[PDB]
Amino acid sequence: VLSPADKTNIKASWEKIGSHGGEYGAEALERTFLCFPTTKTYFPHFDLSHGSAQVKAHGKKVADALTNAVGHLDDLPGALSALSDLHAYKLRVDPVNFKLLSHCLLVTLASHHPAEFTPAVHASLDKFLSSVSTVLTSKYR
């Protein structure tokens, strides 16, 4: 459950990320397949080479999706309906995998903005990725 200080911290931290959104999502995925390879099996279609325009584009979907998420911190269930529909009904993604990716996003954000990645911000954003994950793994259609 995010507090208003959690909201302030995610809102402040997220636009500081900004245009570099798409580029950090891609790094957050590359980092995921690399440290945790079993999660490669969710994208057997995908070109998962280190170049990949694909991993990049998809890396842009994630980033966008989380922006959507920070715009409606008050109604994540409602904003995240369709993505929940996808990750829970259609892809049946195992909840451990959101925690890997979620952690991989943090390593990434911390390696790029060390000034904004304060101990408190770290706390709020982990709660956030922990809350978006629960939506994306629950079925409530």
Add this chain to the structure above:
Amino acid sequence: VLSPADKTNIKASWEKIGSHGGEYGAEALERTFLCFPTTKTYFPHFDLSHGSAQVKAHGKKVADALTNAVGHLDDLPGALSALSDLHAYKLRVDPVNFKLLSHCLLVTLASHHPAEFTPAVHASLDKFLSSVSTVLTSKYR
């Protein structure tokens, strides 16, 4: 995230529990200390013998608390403020312990109402104890 079918199922299942509320909470705790003894350390004050009027009374607080919870499935954060305040700020309860107790509640409910403990009901009520736990472990004061 509970669906309306989750709500119907918890609401239906919970009043079927009813007066036997207090008595199942106590069993759910006894079962917790027994299968998982490290969780005894949260109640070093307590008489934790098998008789215990205390474990019984406290067993009545839990049960009540969850009733409160089923009355406001729509606003758990708001109804569970004070209990969150207690379990998160004051007792700093480790989240593994809600999962032990939560599981112990299920074993208990299943051993008493096998007719209502259908596969679906089992599903809705685990989501529920998983959602009340998150409130009680988050800090948002």
Add this chain to the structure above:
Amino acid sequence: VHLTAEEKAHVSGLWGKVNTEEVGGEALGRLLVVYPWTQRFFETFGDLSSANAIMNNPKVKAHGKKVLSSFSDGLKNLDNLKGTFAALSELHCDKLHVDPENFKLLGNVLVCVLAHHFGKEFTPQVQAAYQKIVAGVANALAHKYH
């Protein structure tokens, strides 16, 4: 796991009373309902989209039966869980990609099913012993992983 004689007896006394025809498929069924992402591993078992489908799917039963006598295997080789589970641990953790967190989840569903079947008779003390068992299996099934 190493549970004592006392514990190995709470366990075997009621395991003797189990219907090995319905208990496994119902724990495997419940696992598929309560934790719906476990569904991904069983795409081949036919239709898993509803509570009653899962519960009545024939394939779920059959394989449940195979899960549960594999638990009966654990109970007969109760102090080399690693060895008796070395073939299944490489299978699950290598060929199938099952996150071992799901091992712990299945033993809890089974425990609830055990409680569901036996009721009052599935005493806390009885559970406690059965937690050692499921934890043990869970952990042996993860050995060639961790």
Add this chain to the structure above:
Amino acid sequence: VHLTAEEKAHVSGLWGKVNTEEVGGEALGRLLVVYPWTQRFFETFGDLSSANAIMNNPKVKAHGKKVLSSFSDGLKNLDNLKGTFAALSELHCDKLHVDPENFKLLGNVLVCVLAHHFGKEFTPQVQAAYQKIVAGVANALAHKYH
């Protein structure tokens, strides 16, 4: 854990560059902020109610320093993690009651701190190796538990 030569080198190259004075207390600090229930184990360390208190508490630092050179111990005994961590595993899992899920959590905080310190240089490949390390420690610290 057994990581290869290649991996043992990604790891040691940058571990040589670490400030062992600030890195541990900051991972222990972060652990206390990000996962506030870990606070219960350290009631004696004085005031943990705020982000900056934790971060500036002197006792947090001191013990952080002790956590992190205990990681430097893991790195020198990198293929008997069990043995080198048999004293700490009985300590934590017996005298202190630390749920081993918290082991995994601390190694992730440290990883983020590593990423925070080194930035671009903390490459995915570098991380990947450091995940094997933290996972290994986490798992050795739980051996006389599981």
